[PDB]
GROMACS .gro file of C-alpha atoms in nm:
model
  182
    1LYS     CA    1   6.933  -9.770   2.708
    2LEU     CA    2   6.620  -9.968   2.637
    3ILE     CA    3   6.258  -9.861   2.575
    4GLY     CA    4   5.965 -10.095   2.506
    5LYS     CA    5   5.671 -10.049   2.270
    6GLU     CA    6   5.410  -9.954   2.530
    7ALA     CA    7   5.651  -9.713   2.700
    8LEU     CA    8   5.738  -9.554   2.361
    9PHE     CA    9   5.368  -9.514   2.271
   10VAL     CA   10   5.308  -9.339   2.603
   11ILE     CA   11   5.613  -9.111   2.568
   12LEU     CA   12   5.506  -8.996   2.215
   13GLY     CA   13   5.145  -8.944   2.337
   14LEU     CA   14   5.242  -8.746   2.649
   15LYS     CA   15   5.472  -8.521   2.442
   16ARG     CA   16   5.198  -8.486   2.177
   17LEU     CA   17   4.923  -8.383   2.427
   18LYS     CA   18   5.151  -8.190   2.658
   19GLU     CA   19   4.976  -7.852   2.611
   20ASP     CA   20   4.613  -7.977   2.618
   21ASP     CA   21   4.530  -8.042   2.988
   22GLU     CA   22   4.200  -8.208   2.891
   23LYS     CA   23   4.334  -8.457   2.636
   24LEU     CA   24   4.648  -8.521   2.846
   25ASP     CA   25   4.455  -8.627   3.156
   26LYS     CA   26   4.230  -8.862   2.955
   27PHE     CA   27   4.536  -9.010   2.782
   28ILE     CA   28   4.700  -9.067   3.123
   29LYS     CA   29   4.392  -9.243   3.263
   30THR     CA   30   4.350  -9.451   2.945
   31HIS     CA   31   4.708  -9.547   2.847
   32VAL     CA   32   4.942  -9.467   3.137
   33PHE     CA   33   4.770  -9.618   3.444
   34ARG     CA   34   4.783  -9.972   3.291
   35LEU     CA   35   5.159  -9.951   3.225
   36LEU     CA   36   5.358 -10.221   3.411
   37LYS     CA   37   5.624 -10.108   3.660
   38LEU     CA   38   5.920 -10.150   3.426
   39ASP     CA   39   5.745  -9.947   3.156
   40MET     CA   40   5.647  -9.661   3.386
   41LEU     CA   41   6.002  -9.634   3.512
   42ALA     CA   42   6.109  -9.640   3.147
   43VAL     CA   43   5.872  -9.353   3.060
   44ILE     CA   44   5.974  -9.134   3.354
   45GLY     CA   45   6.341  -9.202   3.286
   46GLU     CA   46   6.309  -9.092   2.921
   47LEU     CA   47   6.107  -8.784   3.007
   48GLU     CA   48   6.374  -8.690   3.268
   49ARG     CA   49   6.653  -8.739   3.019
   50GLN     CA   50   6.473  -8.520   2.764
   51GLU     CA   51   6.393  -8.263   3.038
   52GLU     CA   52   6.020  -8.286   2.986
   53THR     CA   53   5.995  -8.211   3.356
   54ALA     CA   54   5.625  -8.112   3.368
   55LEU     CA   55   5.538  -8.453   3.214
   56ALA     CA   56   5.789  -8.625   3.444
   57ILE     CA   57   5.619  -8.470   3.747
   58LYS     CA   58   5.289  -8.610   3.618
   59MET     CA   59   5.447  -8.954   3.578
   60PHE     CA   60   5.586  -8.935   3.930
   61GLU     CA   61   5.236  -8.859   4.062
   62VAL     CA   62   5.093  -9.161   3.880
   63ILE     CA   63   5.381  -9.377   4.001
   64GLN     CA   64   5.329  -9.289   4.366
   65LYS     CA   65   4.976  -9.429   4.337
   66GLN     CA   66   5.086  -9.769   4.205
   67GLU     CA   67   5.048 -10.093   4.414
   68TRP     CA   68   5.420 -10.166   4.373
   69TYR     CA   69   5.538  -9.822   4.480
   70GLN     CA   70   5.810  -9.776   4.742
   71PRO     CA   71   5.995  -9.439   4.786
   72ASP     CA   72   6.341  -9.468   4.633
   73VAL     CA   73   6.626  -9.218   4.660
   74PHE     CA   74   6.733  -9.271   4.298
   75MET     CA   75   6.384  -9.204   4.169
   76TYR     CA   76   6.391  -8.874   4.362
   77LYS     CA   77   6.746  -8.803   4.257
   78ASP     CA   78   6.663  -8.841   3.886
   79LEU     CA   79   6.367  -8.609   3.901
   80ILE     CA   80   6.538  -8.340   4.111
   81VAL     CA   81   6.840  -8.342   3.881
   82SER     CA   82   6.615  -8.309   3.578
   83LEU     CA   83   6.428  -8.021   3.740
   84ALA     CA   84   6.754  -7.836   3.826
   85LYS     CA   85   6.871  -7.881   3.465
   86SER     CA   86   6.543  -7.715   3.355
   87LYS     CA   87   6.583  -7.425   3.600
   88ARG     CA   88   6.288  -7.531   3.811
   89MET     CA   89   6.486  -7.481   4.136
   90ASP     CA   90   6.187  -7.438   4.366
   91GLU     CA   91   6.026  -7.755   4.240
   92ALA     CA   92   6.360  -7.936   4.276
   93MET     CA   93   6.416  -7.813   4.634
   94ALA     CA   94   6.061  -7.912   4.724
   95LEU     CA   95   6.115  -8.266   4.597
   96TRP     CA   96   6.438  -8.282   4.798
   97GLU     CA   97   6.246  -8.188   5.113
   98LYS     CA   98   5.979  -8.450   5.038
   99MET     CA   99   6.250  -8.708   4.990
  100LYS     CA  100   6.401  -8.630   5.335
  101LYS     CA  101   6.060  -8.666   5.497
  102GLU     CA  102   6.043  -9.024   5.368
  103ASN     CA  103   6.360  -9.103   5.562
  104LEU     CA  104   6.577  -9.207   5.266
  105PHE     CA  105   6.959  -9.223   5.252
  106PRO     CA  106   7.137  -9.041   4.969
  107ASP     CA  107   7.487  -9.174   4.891
  108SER     CA  108   7.768  -8.922   4.847
  109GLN     CA  109   7.729  -8.899   4.469
  110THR     CA  110   7.363  -8.811   4.509
  111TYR     CA  111   7.440  -8.520   4.749
  112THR     CA  112   7.712  -8.410   4.513
  113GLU     CA  113   7.505  -8.425   4.193
  114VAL     CA  114   7.218  -8.225   4.346
  115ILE     CA  115   7.461  -7.966   4.485
  116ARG     CA  116   7.632  -7.929   4.146
  117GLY     CA  117   7.287  -7.893   3.991
  118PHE     CA  118   7.183  -7.610   4.224
  119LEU     CA  119   7.520  -7.428   4.189
  120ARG     CA  120   7.497  -7.446   3.810
  121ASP     CA  121   7.159  -7.269   3.830
  122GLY     CA  122   7.297  -6.990   4.047
  123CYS     CA  123   7.121  -7.109   4.364
  124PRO     CA  124   7.380  -7.123   4.641
  125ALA     CA  125   7.116  -7.113   4.916
  126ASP     CA  126   6.962  -7.437   4.785
  127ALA     CA  127   7.307  -7.597   4.742
  128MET     CA  128   7.398  -7.508   5.103
  129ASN     CA  129   7.066  -7.660   5.219
  130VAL     CA  130   7.156  -7.991   5.057
  131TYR     CA  131   7.515  -7.956   5.188
  132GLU     CA  132   7.384  -7.914   5.547
  133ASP     CA  133   7.172  -8.227   5.493
  134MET     CA  134   7.484  -8.406   5.371
  135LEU     CA  135   7.669  -8.314   5.692
  136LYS     CA  136   7.388  -8.481   5.896
  137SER     CA  137   7.401  -8.804   5.689
  138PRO     CA  138   7.475  -9.136   5.870
  139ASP     CA  139   7.779  -9.165   5.639
  140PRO     CA  140   8.102  -8.968   5.688
  141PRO     CA  141   8.126  -8.703   5.410
  142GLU     CA  142   8.350  -8.764   5.109
  143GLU     CA  143   8.575  -8.488   4.986
  144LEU     CA  144   8.437  -8.447   4.631
  145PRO     CA  145   8.120  -8.258   4.733
  146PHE     CA  146   8.342  -8.006   4.920
  147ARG     CA  147   8.558  -7.946   4.609
  148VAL     CA  148   8.245  -7.884   4.404
  149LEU     CA  149   8.111  -7.638   4.663
  150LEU     CA  150   8.434  -7.443   4.713
  151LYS     CA  151   8.466  -7.389   4.341
  152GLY     CA  152   8.098  -7.301   4.288
  153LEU     CA  153   8.099  -7.061   4.590
  154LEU     CA  154   8.383  -6.827   4.483
  155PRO     CA  155   8.139  -6.539   4.416
  156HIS     CA  156   8.008  -6.592   4.775
  157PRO     CA  157   8.312  -6.592   5.004
  158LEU     CA  158   8.114  -6.604   5.328
  159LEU     CA  159   7.950  -6.934   5.224
  160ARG     CA  160   8.274  -7.058   5.071
  161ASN     CA  161   8.474  -6.981   5.390
  162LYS     CA  162   8.217  -7.153   5.605
  163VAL     CA  163   8.241  -7.469   5.389
  164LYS     CA  164   8.625  -7.440   5.392
  165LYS     CA  165   8.610  -7.431   5.773
  166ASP     CA  166   8.370  -7.724   5.799
  167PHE     CA  167   8.618  -7.925   5.595
  168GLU     CA  168   8.930  -7.838   5.796
  169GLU     CA  169   8.740  -7.921   6.114
  170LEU     CA  170   8.610  -8.254   5.979
  171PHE     CA  171   8.931  -8.366   5.810
  172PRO     CA  172   9.224  -8.207   5.996
  173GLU     CA  173   9.470  -8.458   5.854
  174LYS     CA  174   9.320  -8.468   5.506
  175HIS     CA  175   9.279  -8.088   5.486
  176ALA     CA  176   9.655  -8.069   5.530
  177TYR     CA  177   9.784  -8.285   5.244
  178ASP     CA  178   9.478  -8.267   5.019
  179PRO     CA  179   9.295  -7.931   5.015
  180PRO     CA  180   8.954  -7.938   4.843
  181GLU     CA  181   8.991  -7.557   4.862
  182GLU     CA  182   9.300  -7.571   4.638
   0.00000   0.00000   0.00000
């Protein structure tokens, strides 16, 4: 992608001061608060990609305070997925709960990516939580998230069988000629 000069200066400075709480906070107040919207999104996106999740959480906190801020599912998705990839499952789940409270609407790929993230980290309970949220979505569920779950839940046949049963009951016709279980 595409990272401007101010955004790049901030990213290098945050990573530089990462372990000094004192210097970091002053740097944030001095160089990060003035960032324009596009540049803040650019900085949090790069931190998330690099899995500098502690700095990303700080950026998200600054962002929420901005005059232009409006809760966005993708902004939450990106952070949660970065957290799961860094094995901060509790922080990730907590952000997912906060997202739900803001009444946002994950698309199917969002449910699926979060679920894959939790399963990868060996957290079936968290995956199932997101799965149960997916079943309550306004949208009808797509099959892909079920295939992910059934393959990630082999070591946990009670969870896997429950998912398998939710599918057959939700897609009687589709279960028949296209098993996600298979």
